[PDB]
Amino acid sequence: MIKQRTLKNIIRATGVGLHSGEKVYLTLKPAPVDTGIVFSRTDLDPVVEIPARAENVGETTMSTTLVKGDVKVDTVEHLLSAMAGLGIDNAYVELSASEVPIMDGSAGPFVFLIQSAGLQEQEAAKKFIRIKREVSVEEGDKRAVFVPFDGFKVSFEIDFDHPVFTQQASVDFSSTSFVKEVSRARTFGFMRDIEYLRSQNLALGGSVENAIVVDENRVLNEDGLRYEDEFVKHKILDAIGDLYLLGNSLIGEFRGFKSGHALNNQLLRTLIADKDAWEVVTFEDARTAP
Numbered sequence: 001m002i003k004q005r006t007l008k009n010i011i012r013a014t015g016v017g018l019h020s021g022e023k024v025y026l027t028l029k030p031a032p033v034d035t036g037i038v039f040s041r042t043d044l045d046p047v048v049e050i051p052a053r054a055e056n057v058g059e060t061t062m063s064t065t066l067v068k069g070d071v072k073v074d075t076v077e078h079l080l081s082a083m084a085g086l087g088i089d090n091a092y093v094e095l096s097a098s099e100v101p102i103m104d105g106s107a108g109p110f111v112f113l114i115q116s117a118g119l120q121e122q123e124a125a126k127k128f129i130r131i132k133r134e135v136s137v138e139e140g141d142k143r144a145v146f147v148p149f150d151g152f153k154v155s156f157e158i159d160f161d162h163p164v165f166t167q168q169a170s171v172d173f174s175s176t177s178f179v180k181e182v183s184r185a186r187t188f189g190f191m192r193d194i195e196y197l198r199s200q201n202l203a204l205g206g207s208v209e210n211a212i213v214v215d216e217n218r219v220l221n222e223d224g225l226r227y228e229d230e231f232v233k234h235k236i237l238d239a240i241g242d243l244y245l246l247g248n249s250l251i252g253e254f255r256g257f258k259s260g261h262a263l264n265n266q267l268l269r270t271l272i273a274d275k276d277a278w279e280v281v282t283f284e285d286a287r288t289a290p
């Protein structure tokens with residue numbers, strides 16, 4: 001049967017919040033069967049834990065933020081994307097501040113840390129959400145869609161009227177490596193937006209160390225891009241993080257058109273609300289499973 005996984009060993013890491021600019025200490029701990037992913041603000045007394053679930057997403061439009069009361073955790077999408085990538089069902093994520101460390105702007109450091117400390121299978125069936133019906137959301141010229149698909153796949157398209165722009169990509173994660181083809185894909189910002197956001201006391205941790213910085217014409221980062229299609233691969237990475245807020249791995253296919261975390265969140269909520277469109281499934285034989 002396909003079994004729930006947690007971590008074998010705890011993992012510690014240090015970084016800076018993209019927005020807060022704060023030094024943050026991160027601890028990933030193993031967790032019992034059916035825990036899910038739980039974020040923990042250890043700096044607070046008493047400690048505040050927010051389950052990494054769609055119901056707990058705050059109305060923050062810079063990044064994916066979890067809330068409970070007036071306590072927040074900012075920029076969860078890259079870490080969740082890394083746990084999604086490696087099929088982690090159960091883990092505590094301890095933080096010493098309000099924001100996940102940005103590290104290098106991608107999921108690579110997080111995927112390295114997780115596999116460094118190993119995975120532990122647990123004596124419980126892994127539960128999957130299987131897409132049964134197409135579910136679509138739009139707003140203006142943006143669109144986000146679930147389609148039934150025997151497997152897991154993400155297609156994305158962006159359309160920036162900028163000289164620096166493939167703006168399309170499609171990855172079947174049952175045939176292609178999350179780790180090799182998507183995990184190293186970094187976040188990106190335009191020089192004028194960064195200048196603005198700095199003026200509003202935001203992007204305080206941003207640098208070429210943790211982002212592709214783009215002016216009107218070109219990539220400013222001396223060493224360039226990691227993929228010809230790094231920008232749209234980072235969109236895929238982000239979506240995979242957002243999807244993992246379902247609290248169960250997906251059997252189906254996602255399509256983004258100029259989508260972001262706000263419309264991504266609308267699609268998760270519309271899916272959860274339409275019980276005709278999905279079922280939870282387990283697999284007694286890993287050999288016959290998609």
Ligand SMILES: COC[C@@H]1C[C@H]1C#CC#Cc1ccc(C(=O)NC[C@H]2C[C@@H](NC(=O)[C@@H]3C[C@H](F)CN3)CN2C(=O)C2CC2)cc1
Pocket residue numbers: 062063064075077186187188189190194197203205206207208209211213234238
């Ligand atoms: C020493 O270096 C000097 C350079 C000048 C210093 C700097 C810096 C910085 C920065 C920075 C980078 C990125 C950003 C930033 O918020 N980028 C958003 C980008 C990338 C992608 N969203 C994501 O990645 C999401 C959100 C967060 F980004 C992490 N998950 C979609 N997206 C867009 O559509 C923007 C609107 C055009 C915001 C800020």
Ligand SMILES: [Zn+2]
Pocket residue numbers: 077078187234238
């Ligand atoms: Zn991102």
